[PDB]
Design a protein around this ligand. Structure first.
Ligand SMILES: CC1(COc2ccc(CC3=[SH]C(=O)NC3=O)cc2)CCCCC1
Length: 261
């Protein structure tokens, strides 16, 4: 019955809002500076970056500070995602070692999915939207850290072209966690039973919310290829900073879900 799917769709969107402080709705409202009830401070070089603290709650180089921000932002999102994931029906019932494995492997694909909500083609919101750092300022950093964000902007523009809203994303990111082809899953079939369910919810949720978009379902499922390549590119980048920056700490949670290859 499609009516139970809808009850599932509503439950997830509700836990989504409850787990993530900055929705896509709030982000698009900040970004279209026609809604100027709260406008972002814009960082665009190092001058802007320095004044961004006379204004915003924010000798140790800048590209690394930039990056250990992106680091501890990633910690932030992982804890919001694991909280969101507990709320997915059946997920907390699963073998504990497999809870950990869906999370290990689904979380980064989910940071970059949601990173798109914060993104347009010129930059990305910062500190839960108070600030907005340009895409070029990012591109300009010290020669290694000078391109880590660049494949996110690449995916985000093409992903944001589908124009999903949060009530669509909440079901999509659930599908991502509940994959079943993650490495090392002891019992995968109950995982596939839940995802069959999430897929059905997602399919009819897109069908009802975007009824002029033939096969948005097929086209949204394809973008899962782009997340996998973002994650690999990122882990490769990550290793170069390790060696060419032996003074560069990394958070052990991030360090923990990063078991490479
Ligand atoms: C991480 C962003 C936005 O979110 C940020 C928040 C804060 C800082 C700066 C910080 S956070 C800290 O603990 N110390 C700092 O110097 C940087 C970024 C999203 C991903 C793309 C790059 C930017």
């Amino acid at each position: 019955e499609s009516a139970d799917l809808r009850a599932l769709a509503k439950h997830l969107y509700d836990s989504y809002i409850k787990s993530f402080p900055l929705t896509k709705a709030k982000a698009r409202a900040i970004l279209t500076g026609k809604t100027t009830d709260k406008s972002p401070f814009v960082i665009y070089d190092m001058n802007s970056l320095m004044m961004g603290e006379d204004k915003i709650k924010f000798s140790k180089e800048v590209a690394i500070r930039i990056f250990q921000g992106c680091q501890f932002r990633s910690v932030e999102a992982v804890q919001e995602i694991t909280e969101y994931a507990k709320s997915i029906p059946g997920f907390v019932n699963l073998d504990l070692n497999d809870q950990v494995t869906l999370l290990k492997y689904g979380v980064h694909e989910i940071i970059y999915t949601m990173l798109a909500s914060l993104m347009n083609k010129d930059g990305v919101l910062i500190s839960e939207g108070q600030g907005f750092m340009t895409r070029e300022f990012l591109k300009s950093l010290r020669k290694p850290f000078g391109d880590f964000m660049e494949p996110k902007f690449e995916f985000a523009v093409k992903f944001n072209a589908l124009e999903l809203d949060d009530s669509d994303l909440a079901i999509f990111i659930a599908v991502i966690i509940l994959s079943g082809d993650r490495p090392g899953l002891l019992n995968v079939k109950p995982i596939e039973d839940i995802q069959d369910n999430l897929l059905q919810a997602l399919e009819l949720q897109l069908k009802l919310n975007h009824p002029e978009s033939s096969q948005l379902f097929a086209k949204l499922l394809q973008k899962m290829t782009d997340l996998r390549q973002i994650v690999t590119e990122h882990v490769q980048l990550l290793q170069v900073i390790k060696k060419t920056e032996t003074d560069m700490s990394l958070h052990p949670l991030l360090q923990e879900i990063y078991k490479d290859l």
